[PDB]
Amino acid sequence: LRTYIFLDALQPQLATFIGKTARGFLPVPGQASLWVEIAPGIAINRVTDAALKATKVQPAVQVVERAYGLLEVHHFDQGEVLAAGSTILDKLEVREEGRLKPQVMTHQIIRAVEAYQTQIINRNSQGMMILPGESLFILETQPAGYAVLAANEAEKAANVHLVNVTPYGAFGRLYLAGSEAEIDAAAEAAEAAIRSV
Amino acid sequence: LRTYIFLDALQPQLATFIGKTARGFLPVPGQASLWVEIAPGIAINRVTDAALKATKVQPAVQVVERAYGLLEVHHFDQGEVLAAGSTILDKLEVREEGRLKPQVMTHQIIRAVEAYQTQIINRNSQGMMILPGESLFILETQPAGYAVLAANEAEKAANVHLVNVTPYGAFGRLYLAGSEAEIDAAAEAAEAAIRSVSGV
Amino acid sequence: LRTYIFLDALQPQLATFIGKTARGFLPVPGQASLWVEIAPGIAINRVTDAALKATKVQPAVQVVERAYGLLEVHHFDQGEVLAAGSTILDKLEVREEGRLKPQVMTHQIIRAVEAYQTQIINRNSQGMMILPGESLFILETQPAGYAVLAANEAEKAANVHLVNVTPYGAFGRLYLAGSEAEIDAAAEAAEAAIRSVSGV
Amino acid sequence: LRTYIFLDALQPQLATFIGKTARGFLPVPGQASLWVEIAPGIAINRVTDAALKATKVQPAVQVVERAYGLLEVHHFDQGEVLAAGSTILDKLEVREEGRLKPQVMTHQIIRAVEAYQTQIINRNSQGMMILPGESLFILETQPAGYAVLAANEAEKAANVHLVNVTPYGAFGRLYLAGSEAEIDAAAEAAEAAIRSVSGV
Amino acid sequence: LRTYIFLDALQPQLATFIGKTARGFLPVPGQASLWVEIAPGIAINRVTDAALKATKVQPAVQVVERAYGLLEVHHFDQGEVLAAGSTILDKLEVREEGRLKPQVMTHQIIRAVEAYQTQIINRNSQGMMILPGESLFILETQPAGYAVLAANEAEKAANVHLVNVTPYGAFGRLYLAGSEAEIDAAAEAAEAAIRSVSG
Amino acid sequence: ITLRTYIFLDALQPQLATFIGKTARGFLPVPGQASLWVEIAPGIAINRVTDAALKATKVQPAVQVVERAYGLLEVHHFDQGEVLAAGSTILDKLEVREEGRLKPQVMTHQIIRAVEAYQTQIINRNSQGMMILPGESLFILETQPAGYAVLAANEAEKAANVHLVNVTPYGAFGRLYLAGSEAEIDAAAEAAEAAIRSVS
């Protein structure tokens, strides 16, 4: 069990980013959302099947990457999602606390990003544009799944733009853009959330 | 000469969108930008060559379509971009006014788009994401090259988000997202810009 | 109103194929499914919005192609889908029978396809694989949206494999694979379904 | 029958370019290569099946395009490929000279291409890279399938680089790069090759 | 030498899957098929060159991924393929047994997969589609190359559908779909095949 | 921060610059420009390096790749002083000196003489640079960290008449493919290996 984290309600940009990029059943803002990462990757199919047979949740994500596998299930009813999470933990025979604790590989604020840099960031991103002169928050977590918690709590806490989030792979990466003050608040919220796991 | 439109200064989102999609030298906001659409599209390489050998402009775009060809050249110095444009028009043996006059084919404001619909829009888009509940402006131009004018002027006129712009084909398509009030102003600015262009 | 076709229940392979290629809310087998193709295409966003604001349907497909636009909406409740259809027709200010009557443009059965040909078919397809020696049904419809009706009814009628279906463009194209007799039955049902559609 | 051209032996770069882009059985240099373009395109699967059932040829290419269809079949032995053509001509009730006689719609040499322009060309190309300062030959043929003859004979006659070739659509497009002298010879050989083709 | 496995005759779905996804000279059902995986990845070009210079085999696959390299060569004549393999081993100065023995990290049957889950599996797959209500066999091997043996032997033994096989990467993954009993017979034959190779 | 790669190229050779321009996501260079490559871990932290170089100099970035584990930056300018000023800024920022970089090691280096057509066809289908043609020799080089592969490419191209087939200077291992005559490949390989060995 690499990642296990429950989002009580998806913020609009995160839900929209998942919808623009994920392969599965799109979530909408406000739905509860549970994320589960495990190894080996292909074995996530066992987790998905358990959750879907037990509850009415819908999966936005089942990724099997080089080494790991990641699942998202969602529903407008928090308890329906939480019911799916309990089922998953029973199938895995581990409790919520047996999850790997998230580590922050990088947390940095880059002020007044130059146009040359935003152009490359943006060409590699599918979320909101970072525009020249905006501040950039970059967060790298390990394992990758927890990046969504940082993204959701940051968006909840400040007026910022979700540029990109990658909650799978060796490392989970998050890009936010906004004014310096809003990015400061978004960064504080994201970090306070990762450390609360 | 189908399209010959000079943008005095690229607005930030349009410049960023070009940075996301162009296959040439990426621009940056504030640069002057000339877009030239021609028929036949195979001659675009000769037009590009004329502009580049005469001036210091950098080309963000050269698209050879099934019929039409599109070029973008830019520079911070408007003089470089207009020098390139003059070179092009003189080679084509046309005057700027000889360009096709653009027409607003289709224009629609869709208020408070539902979440389901913002997903299909977003998955077909590379610009800003439209969020559920935002209003959507959809514009079609003929010829298609002029859609970058609608995008640039809309962004100048209103606090809207550029979701996507496609300035090549028979019709140029533009998608903007924002509040209803912002989209109202962006829509009018986009349409007023298209109709302000003299030509054939 | 180019295409307007109601599918009472999505067959498993067609629903799975939509799940593979659609950029909207993926459907599941057994759901009612309405497909709407219009000209001008760009106006599909207004059609989609009207259906989503009026009903609980979810959209699997919204394709802005070139001159046409295609929408799919679905729901397990046939009533919600029919309600969305009437909402669309009223928004378009047309009646169902005002749709273009579809025509079988081309229909072919290739018996016992060679391995060298199945490789190329499969590389241009996202559905089931056609295996060497299986028969291949190739269908073209006009308008293109009705191709999903041919696919759904063929799967209803025969034990065949959905290789690929493309219900957007000037002609809709369908590829099915299976034994000769089953392909004969699939082609019959697909062609009959197309001819059973009323329109102009 | 739009295109019917027999290439006695694929030249190395053209064979390599096909290997890079085709979705069938990759050829190698020196093999005989027959290219068949037909209308309607959807009938191409039926022509492919006839050729494969009658001979040992392997198909590198089968593209069904919005109007036309293109097939490539090849074999180390010219006879096999000629046998496949003989079968295709019999299946079509047409002779070799019943093909459309191709014509050179466009032919341009752009000398000393600027670095900015070679970038965009290269990002839209899968063959050899054109390097800054090299000359660029741009040819268009109609029917499009004959563009591979222009490519094969240009490569036979001159030390030039195949940048890209597209043998389908309304026009076949050929981009070559090299020194001014090499490109001059390649252009003349290409144009002569197309002129040497008989047909309606 | 990470993977070295010989398939006497490619089954139809496996051959077709290779044909739809591989970058190379596409094989056809019935051809003999040899798979070789090594590290360093880029060094697979030496292996390919030896096999092609010595025999008439055609390569369906030469993948250079993050870390490893994978080759497939095939021919209707098992003799050409076996001659190509021994040439490879001769050039590597290795014997067939010096290969890493494949492990079985994941092997699971998921019965009656829900439509939500099949839609995702399918959107990530290029083989046959798994349909809602079918059973799913999932198998992971290390090294990845050996997945093709499980696929070929599974298809030979049971009426199942090849959904996907990825014989390159850190781990070789196999997805089969079908009825539960047929999937059980397929899994039986696949697992027996994997653990029956020395190394 | 771990400084995996730091290497300065005095002048980009034509094929390398063209390959960067054909493949990279950024502001793409032209031949003759000075080029600095910086690879670090953690991957996303490359953004700090980029920011420091851009805020202090006029360099433009051709590359900022954040892959599975590492991040790679390229900055370039015709004035070597701008590029070296950017490099000094980066090193001062990272608080490391030039020689604190990970020393590159020639991992795999091999020449494959007279490559068969079956093999070139696969290599080419997996490559974006020049073609390798059957019968040409192939130089394959692996480097660790991957960033230093560009030095081998540039010096190999400077030293011999070879073709850049592909270079991947990011990932776990940096890989270089060159094609040419046996003798030209021999010289290119020697020049490439000597350069890598000479990095402190």
Q: Under an 8 Å CB criterion, which residues of F touch B?
A: 26-28
- Report how far residue E187's alpha carbon sits from residue A145's, in angstroms, rounded to the nearest whole number: 31
The sign one gets for the Cα dihedral F148, F153, F156, F159 is negative
Contact F169, F149 (CB under 8 A): yes
> What's the CATH fold of domain B101-200?
Alpha-Beta Plaits (3.30.70)
User: Which site among C20, C23, C38, C42 would you substitute to test the B interface, given the most B Cβ atoms closer than 10 Å to its Cβ?
Assistant: C42
Q: Where does A101-197 sit in CATH, by number? A: 3.30.70.1710
> What's the CATH fold of domain F1-102?
Alpha-Beta Plaits (3.30.70)
User: Which site among F12, F15, F18, F161 would you substitute to test the D interface, given the most D Cβ atoms closer than 10 Å to its Cβ?
Assistant: F18
CB contacts of F118 in chain E (<8 Å) are 24-25, 48, 52, 58-59
- Computed on alpha carbons and rounded to an integer, the radius of gyration of chain B in Å comes to 16
N residues, chain E: 199
Angle E5-E11-E16 (CA atoms, 0-180°, nearest 5)?
105
Size of interface A-E (CB pairs under 8 A): 61
Contact across the interface for D120 and B23, Cβ inside 8 Å: yes
Question: What is the least distance, in Å, from the CA of F111 to any CA of chain B?
Answer: 34
Angle B41-B61-B148 (CA atoms, 0-180°, nearest 5)?
95
Contact across the interface for F131 and D131, Cβ inside 8 Å: no
Distances (CA, A) of E139 to E105, E146, E161: 8, 11, 14
Backbone angles phi, psi at C7, to 5 degrees: -105, 120
Contact F7, F192 (CB under 8 A): no
Instruction: Let me know if the fold of B1-100 is the same as that of B101-200.
Output: yes
Backbone angles phi, psi at B36, to 5 degrees: -125, 120
Q: How far apart are the first and last CA of chain E?
A: 10
List, in order, residues 6 or more apart from B44 with CB less than 8 Å away.
Answer: B36, B38, B62, B63, B64, B69, B70, B71
CB contacts of C116 in chain E (<8 Å) are 28
Correct CATH for E101-199 of 3.20.20.70, 2.160.10.10, 3.30.70.1710, 3.30.565.10: 3.30.70.1710
Contact across the interface for C25 and B110, Cβ inside 8 Å: no
Quick one: which of F82, F83, F1, F2 has its CA closest to F36? F83
Residue A169 zone, left/alpha/beta (φ > 0; ψ -120 to 50; rest): left
Quick one: which of F1, F92, F93 has its CA closest to A140? F1
Angle C41-C42-C47 (CA atoms, 0-180°, nearest 5)?
85
Which of D42, D49, D61 is the closest to C113 by Cβ?
D49
Question: What is the least distance, in Å, from the CA of A57 to any CA of chain F?
Answer: 31
N residues, chain B: 200
Q: What DSSP assignment string belongs to D134-152?
A: -EEEEEEEESGGGHHHHHH
Question: What is the least distance, in Å, from the CA of E123 to any CA of chain C?
Answer: 4
Contact across the interface for B16 and A127, Cβ inside 8 Å: no
- Report how far residue C45's alpha carbon sits from residue C65's, in angstroms, rounded to the nearest whole number: 13
Q: What DSSP assignment string belongs to A128-171?
A: SPPPTT-EEEEEEEESGGGHHHHHHHHHHHSS-EEEEEE-SSSS
Using CA coordinates, name the residue in chain A closest to E115. Answer: A52
Quick one: which of D135, D195, D185, D192 has its CA closest to D157? D185
- Report how far residue D192's alpha carbon sits from residue D139's, in angstroms, rounded to the nearest whole number: 12
Which of D117, D123, D140 is the closest to B42 by Cβ?
D140
User: Which site among C16, C25, C28 would you substitute to test the A interface, given the most A Cβ atoms closer than 10 Å to its Cβ?
Assistant: C25
Contact across the interface for C116 and D25, Cβ inside 8 Å: yes
Quick one: which of E122, E62, F73 has its CA closest to C28? E122
What ranges do the domains of chain B cover?
Answer: 1-100, 101-200
What method was applied to determine this entry?
X-ray
Q: How far apart are the first and last CA of chain B?
A: 10
Question: What is the least distance, in Å, from the CA of C62 to any CA of chain A?
Answer: 14
Residue E101: strand, helix, or coil: coil
Half-sphere exposure of B143 (CA within 13 A, CB side): 23
Superfamily name and number for F103-200? BMC (bacterial microcompartment) domain (3.30.70.1710)
List, in order, residues 6 or more apart from D196 with CB less than 8 Å away.
Answer: none
Q: What is the dihedral of CA E153, E158, E159, E162, to 10 degrees?
A: -30
- Report how far residue A51's alpha carbon sits from residue A84's, in angstroms, rounded to the nearest whole number: 5
Q: Where does E1-100 sit in CATH, by number? A: 3.30.70.1710
Contact across the interface for B25 and F26, Cβ inside 8 Å: no
List, in order, residues 6 or more apart from F54 with CB less than 8 Å away.
Answer: A114, A116, A117, F61, F75, F86
Contact across the interface for B13 and A132, Cβ inside 8 Å: no
Using CA coordinates, name the residue in chain F closest to E74. Answer: F118
- Report how far residue B42's alpha carbon sits from residue B47's, in angstroms, rounded to the nearest whole number: 10
Tokens standing for A34?
Answer: 């549970």
Angle C50-C54-C59 (CA atoms, 0-180°, nearest 5)?
65
Contact F71, F45 (CB under 8 A): yes
Contact D32, D81 (CB under 8 A): yes
Contact across the interface for C131 and E13, Cβ inside 8 Å: yes
Contact E37, E145 (CB under 8 A): yes
Contact across the interface for A140 and F43, Cβ inside 8 Å: yes
Size of interface B-F (CB pairs under 8 A): 5
The b/e string for A129-160 (b: 16+ C-beta within 10 A; e otherwise) is: bbbbebbbbbbbbbbbbbbbbbbbbbbbbbeb
Contact C122, C26 (CB under 8 A): no
Contact C81, C6 (CB under 8 A): yes
Contact across the interface for E28 and C127, Cβ inside 8 Å: no
- Report how far residue C96's alpha carbon sits from residue C3's, in angstroms, rounded to the nearest whole number: 9
List, in order, residues 6 or more apart from F30 with CB less than 8 Å away.
Answer: D115, D116, D132, F12, F17, F21
Residue A105: strand, helix, or coil: strand
